[PDB]
Amino acid sequence: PDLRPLVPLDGGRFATSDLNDLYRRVINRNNRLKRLLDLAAPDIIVRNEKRMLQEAVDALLDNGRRGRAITGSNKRPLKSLADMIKGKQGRFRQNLLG
Amino acid sequence: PERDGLFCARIFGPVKDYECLCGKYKRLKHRGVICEKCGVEVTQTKVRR
Amino acid sequence: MKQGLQLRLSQQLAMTPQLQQAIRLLQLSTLELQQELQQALESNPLLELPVYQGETTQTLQDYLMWQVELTPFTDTDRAIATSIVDAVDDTGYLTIQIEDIVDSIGDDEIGLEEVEAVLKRIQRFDPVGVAAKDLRDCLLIQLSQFAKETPWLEEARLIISDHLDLLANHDFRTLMRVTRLKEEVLKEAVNLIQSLDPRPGQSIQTSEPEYVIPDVLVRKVSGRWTVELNADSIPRLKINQQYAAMGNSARNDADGQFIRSNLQEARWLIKSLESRNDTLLRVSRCIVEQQQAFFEQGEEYMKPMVLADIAQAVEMHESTISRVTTQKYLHSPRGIFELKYFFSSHVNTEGGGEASSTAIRALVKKLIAAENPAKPLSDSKLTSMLSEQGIMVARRTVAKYRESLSIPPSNQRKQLV
Amino acid sequence: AEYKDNLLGEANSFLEVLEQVSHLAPLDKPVLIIGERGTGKELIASRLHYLSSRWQGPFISLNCAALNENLLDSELFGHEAGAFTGAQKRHPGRFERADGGTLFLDELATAPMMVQEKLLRVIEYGELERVGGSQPLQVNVRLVCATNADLPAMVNEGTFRADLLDRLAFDVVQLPPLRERESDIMLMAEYFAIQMCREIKLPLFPGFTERARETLLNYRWPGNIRELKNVVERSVYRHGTSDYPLDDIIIDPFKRR
Amino acid sequence: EYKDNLLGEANSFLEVLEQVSHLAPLDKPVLIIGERGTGKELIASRLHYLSSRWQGPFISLNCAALNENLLDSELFGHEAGAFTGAQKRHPGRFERADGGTLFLDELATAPMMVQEKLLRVIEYGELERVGGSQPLQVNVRLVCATNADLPAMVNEGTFRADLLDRLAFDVVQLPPLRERESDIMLMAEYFAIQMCREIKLPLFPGFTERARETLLNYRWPGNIRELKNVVERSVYRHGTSDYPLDDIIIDPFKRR
Amino acid sequence: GPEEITADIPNVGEAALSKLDESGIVYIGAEVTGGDILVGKVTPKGETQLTPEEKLLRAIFGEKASDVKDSSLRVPNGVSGTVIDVQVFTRDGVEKDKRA
DNA sequence: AGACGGCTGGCACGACTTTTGCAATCGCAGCCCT
DNA sequence: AGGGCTGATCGTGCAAAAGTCGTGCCAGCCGTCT
């Protein structure tokens, strides 16, 4: 959590984004799969949920490559674990004495 | 901090001070012990990172 | 049409009490109800950077640690100083005793004298309020920092030395007799003690993020406005229509039955949400029936409110209204109050009226405002004032309201002029 | 504090009655009004309730003649349970209306003897009759009365028991007759005409005729109520576009041509 | 416009209509002096047409027949009291139309307590309830109609004098079928057209002088009920006849 | 609880408050340099138990009880100037208006 | 310098609230036991 | 060949014991004046 600060905008809501939105998606999706299989679910729904889960993990790793995830009221993509590595605004940038 | 979730105790490390989340064993006299009602190592805040 | 125990008509209704219905009520769990609904919707099949400045002082605790480290201290001395600094509260008083610190040290060579010397060096730390003792000791430190030209400084020191109990009880007679205090000299000493910076660490913690939840709205523009109770925050979640069509198109009969069961559960959830919204709207109407009267009349002019009476006016179940009241908040132009706080306690009043306990408390607070600063109004005086107001509240009721209003004791609140 | 609007008239009897009402206002004793039909005794009783009762005291206007079923009159006394077809919820409220207030009634002549006797056995001791099995309540409620018939007349008829008639009639408030008032009647008529002109939202002055005043004097007008004055004002209202109306109709069936 | 039901060409009818229009502009009690079968809410229909609540039609429905206890229940209805359950203010006369004008009929059968309740309704008064207190006050105007001379009943002591007087703020006399003589032919023609429409008859095939003479000789107790029966008989007969077919009359009993 | 402006800042000198008016805002036309207080605002704190320590502190000192924290508006550093005019807006339903 | 007084707070008793702990029996009829 | 019997679906309440508040009231104590 120390690498993904809460950064309250209004103080009323912490509103963690770009670092916890995808984590929240994958966490809830995985919980749904994990109690889903123990209920002897039919094949169609379980494969659909697993496909959702694989897509969500892919978006968490790389959103620009596969899929388009946007924030509330903003169409801009999210900054995945690779986004803060690559590009002009990655860790490698500003590492060169920026 | 939540229970078994993001930004939670018993995971990622202790809280801002050496004081435990439950409230007991809140002192530097505790250096490596872990409470019963709450499982948290009594250490610094920097380790949370 | 007055015969008794005649032929019994056939009952055409049932209670039908279902745990599903009670969960649907959710006791108006609000955000908790939202979380439960999210959990169910997850369990229900076919259902539904920033600036990051990160810069702030650590309530001067980091500043204190740096300053102590800035001062030349030995490695063992630095460790002892760090331990002492860790034993600092937000107010600035040490939580642990010197014996506790010595025990935490766990060194036979470590002694009470060395610990005291370290604390005294630590006591004269960089910022004010580093006394780690009673504010009287902090007051002594401030007086030492203050110029010696201040009048009655010696008298204040003598009082704080061993006459602190006399000052605490505001026993001016005995304190003056013991200390030979002059007339109005105690006033000067009290004025000096006013500028003593009590709880200095509180001012250092200037940061204080605001915390508030929207919940219900009582804007009431132009009167009786239907200020939605956070309708934006209401989930209003719905099941997946496409998945439902897939379930409707399911070839397997068992799969179709499972889809039908899921659809029945979704209909139950929709009924629960509709019931919650309807209950919220009815409660809003019932409150607005008299809320404007209370708002205009004032807190001291608050009529008693009965949950049973409100339910009867709304014509819904009384237990349902009681459950809805729990864990419910209603923000208003005056402020944000709980639904129980929205309701009013019942107390007898004169002239054929009922006065809220909060109303009586607010009246008592207003009366306490109109009092001699030197001598606090007695509870007997408060009872006399209430009798003047004609609220049919005796000394016991006045005392209860004062406890609600946290009125200080007459002797304790008494002070020199 | 607040005074209800009343017609202006030079009736020293009305002022004396008002003063007597004021004198009995601090008092809490039964009050009887000898008001005849249409005398507006109810308005006088309400004005008393403003002052005779404690400020903002509960008031209730229940007429015994309005009672439909004597069984319901029993229900007017509180029923605990097991009464009527449905005993689920029972709250007569009349005693609750009585509690912390006074009792006002009109034309108490029509009551059955049992009703009057129960009323006496309740008022004199102060206890409340309960239709369902319960301990009676000593509700402190004042009693105000207003009837047309003479109390001695009923005593000769025997409707009211001597104990009931006496304990029922502690103070006597004779209402002045409308026919008794002549000049005060004219002044109150003018005031009611002004009030009616205000109510009808007609800017033009109503106006009057001397023959109309003479006819109104001829009219018996047994009821001093605003209702008779309202009938007069309606007869005026049938005429429009004239500053001062001429003539009036005693009844709509009258002068049908 | 309320379809201008029962358009009475009589000048007295027009004056009564103008008076009713004046009363509908008002919101005070008014008495309708009617007779059996005459003015059966037609004046009430005109009043609703000219009602201050023109957009929101009043309850109307003055006509009602019920037992004494039944009428009392219609006055006051509580869920717990009486035989019926879970329905309080089941009649809801004031609840039927807020404001507007409360309409009543056959007030003669009302009891003295019922008449007193009516009087309290005439003035500013609270609602009637079997149990509890009814502080609820719903403002609404008053309209009523009976076929008798209540002055005699008050003289006979069969109704409350105060109710009779206060209710009789302005009595609206009504004309009966016997009053309508010249307009009778027009009413017959209008009823014939309406029946031809309702019975799917092509049109009014025409009248007969014998039929008109019989209708005139007919007592015709109802202002429109006699007209309604004559129209129904003529529609049933001429629908097959496709001709005037002399006079078709409706009798409750038929022999030979 | 709500926050109000009443210029009762603890742990502050009278000289800093010597220019502040009773409601808390500064008089029109003043000058300012550094981090001088402009508007006096405080933040309420949650109540505590009996807690004899600050109970005694309140009995001796009082009127603060550590109920509020110093959260007043101050001028940014490295800024010096003079004031022209002030302005305050209050929402309907609140009518404190000490110096509004 | 022992008693007047008012406070305060515990102690008690009715009067209002309120929470949790409560669901069968179907009418289908085919399958299994006898 | 005849009986048993099995699970689908079956929707806004309440009340009763418990708790808790309103109100009053007594017992001691310290500030005090005698």
Ligand SMILES: Nc1ncnc2c1ncn2[C@@H]1O[C@H](COP(=O)(O)OP(=O)(O)O)[C@@H](O)[C@H]1O
């Ligand atoms: N002095 C007065 N001034 C104005 N109005 C009066 C006066 N006396 C009687 N009235 C009117 O008479 C009307 C009925 O009076 P009253 O006969 O007392 O009522 P009730 O029929 O209930 O006895 C009331 O509406 C009231 O306005």
Ligand SMILES: [Mg+2]
């Ligand atoms: Mg009357």
